[PDB]
Write a protein that binds this ligand. Structure first.
Ligand SMILES: *C(=O)[C@H](C[C@@H]1CCNC1=O)NC(=O)[C@H](CC(C)C)NC(=O)/C=C/c1ccccc1
Ligand SMILES: *C(=O)[C@H](C[C@@H]1CCNC1=O)NC(=O)[C@H](CC(C)C)NC(=O)/C=C/c1ccccc1
Lengths: 303, 303
């Protein structure tokens, strides 16, 4: 029993983190086979940050302008190329610690683990969700760019995020490992706003099922609701519409607890309309939306 | 910027996790040099759980009653002994992945990372605090015993917790790595209650400083308070007394934000007396007490 924001074990990714320096700029890179992946803004200087032309900065660079260090072993760069907003630095050594891996792009509402790193050295690990507005609410300081986000299935690491920047609101923005940004952000020093965010409804429901599985039942009721009448309430509270596919995805959790999905919807509607009146759910006074149904099943399987 | 419940990178501990089976009971062990550490209740049977006499079960055991597996490599047990509530299984192979390590016992109010494991295989990592009543609010299922809690400084893993049991309230109890329980718990299948818990005051203050460092300032005021008048309020809300040593420990955070400790105490007093009135601090509608001052400095250093 218990329910915690749980990250994947980070060892397999720790073995892939290197330090990449260009000029006076040092950040993190991801070393897989004989390629090191890092944010392309490592080649930028303070004088070309409003609108850097990246193919230009890059054409003016050599292999010997890139210093790659794995621990305290220097890697020789033998090739460089740009892939959207990431640099691919070919090195003369394949990483002997390369795990089986995939480059996957995730969907808003999905979760992943972030291994925060500085100077190629892992600092901490925590769980993030991709917000509906394609930002993440992370914990990143200067020097953290190139830190990655990932999921693990079996023994295969699915990389899904590389960190590039922080917005004025304090949330974070980055790319998939093909260098394509999540959301309408660009790797340049503005002054960029995220679109309006919303609450991930299917996740809130998943977390209520986690609560029931852990013995928190006070929010349940006899009411049921139609999917239509629920989504009418959801839209008023800035919650994403709940689809039949979300209902199907919640199937196993519904079956394990004997609470129909539309019944839990009726509990959610009351919570949205009345609040909690000073009670908590799984230790929170807020409705939590950064646990997926999979996260709940993975952590609560067999009570 | 940002503030997340952050665990230490788990790689160094992942390399130490093994599977230990005795009879039909399988749980996790910690393999350091040529010793495997695990909960002694691995030698118990269903018929001897109310009051197992452990020296008895142990005298009746041989080395060949213990099957130790590291991944899919079997380790030969060449010696066994009991140290309080842990078993020490001497094996014929020193773990080549042994990190530099220490066995440290922590204090209530201190935090650590837990690597949850099943069948010797790491499942997830998350951050825990030792509660004032010597329980932890973790996430543990059947098969998780022998999972460990730890901190890292530099490259040295300080192990502080091994998991043994869950209480009826859903909180968790275990030992240090010398096998000595945290709190008044025993490794037998009762029905055991924790003493009354309290809120870790110095940590709540640390987290308010984190909030200010991250731009959440709405709870600040011009009031200051005496340490005496604050502790009068704290005792009424089940908060631990704040000592001068706690005030000194908060020194660096006070200096970084320019908010005197006793000034933040005055903010805390108002929050305890009025609540938040629907506002949040660092994304929480509750006052968070599982971040130490060190946790805050480590994550917020340089804004
Ligand atoms: C990379 O390490 C760094 C990570 C930042 C630093 C602070 N928190 C983070 O996540 N990325 C950058 O510094 C990035 C560089 C660009 C050339 C892409 N710029 C930003 O993150 C912020 C730009 C900004 C923010 C707010 C107002 C105006 C500009
Ligand atoms: C070890 O893997 C296991 C972990 C439990 C299982 C469920 N959540 C956990 O943390 N430890 C035990 O099962 C332990 C065995 C004893 C012989 C020490 N017993 C318990 O955790 C619970 C005992 C209990 C709880 C509630 C009411 C009555 C008894």
């Amino acid at each position: 029993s218990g329910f915690r924001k749980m990250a994947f074990p980070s060892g397999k990714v720790e073995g892939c983190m290197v330090q990449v320096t260009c000029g006076t700029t040092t950040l993190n890179g991801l070393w897989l086979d004989d390629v090191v992946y890092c944010p392309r803004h490592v080649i930028c200087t303070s004088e070309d940050m409003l609108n850097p032309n990246y193919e230009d900065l890059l054409i003016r660079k050599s292999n010997h302008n890139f210093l790659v260090q794995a621990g305290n072993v220097q890697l020789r760069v033998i090739g460089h190329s740009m892939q959207n907003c990431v640099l691919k630095l070919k090195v003369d050594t394949a990483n002997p610690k390369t795990p089986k891996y995939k480059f996957v792009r995730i969907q808003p509402g999905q979760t992943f683990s972030v291994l925060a790193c500085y100077n190629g050295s892992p600092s901490g690990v925590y769980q993030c969700a991709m917000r509906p507005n394609f930002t993440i609410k992370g914990s990143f300081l200067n020097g953290s760019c190139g830190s990655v986000g990932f999921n693990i299935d079996y023994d295969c690491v699915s990389f899904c995020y590389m960190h590039h920047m922080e917005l004025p609101t304090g949330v974070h923005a980055g790319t998939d490992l093909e260098g394509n940004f999540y959301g309408p952000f660009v790797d340049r020093q503005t002054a960029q706003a995220a679109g309006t965010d919303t609450t991930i409804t299917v996740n809130v429901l998943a977390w209520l099922y986690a609560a029931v599985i852990n013995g928190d039942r006070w929010f349940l009721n006899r009411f049921t609701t139609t999917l239509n009448d629920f989504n009418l309430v959801a839209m008023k509270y800035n919650y994403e519409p709940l689809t039949q596919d979300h209902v199907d995805i919640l199937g196993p959790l519904s079956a394990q607890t004997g609470i129909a999905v539309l019944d839990m919807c009726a509990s959610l509607k009351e919570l949205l309309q009345n609040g909690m009146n000073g009670r908590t759910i799984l230790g929170s006074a807020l409705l939590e939306d950064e646990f997926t149904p999979f996260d709940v099943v993975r952590q609560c399987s067999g009570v």
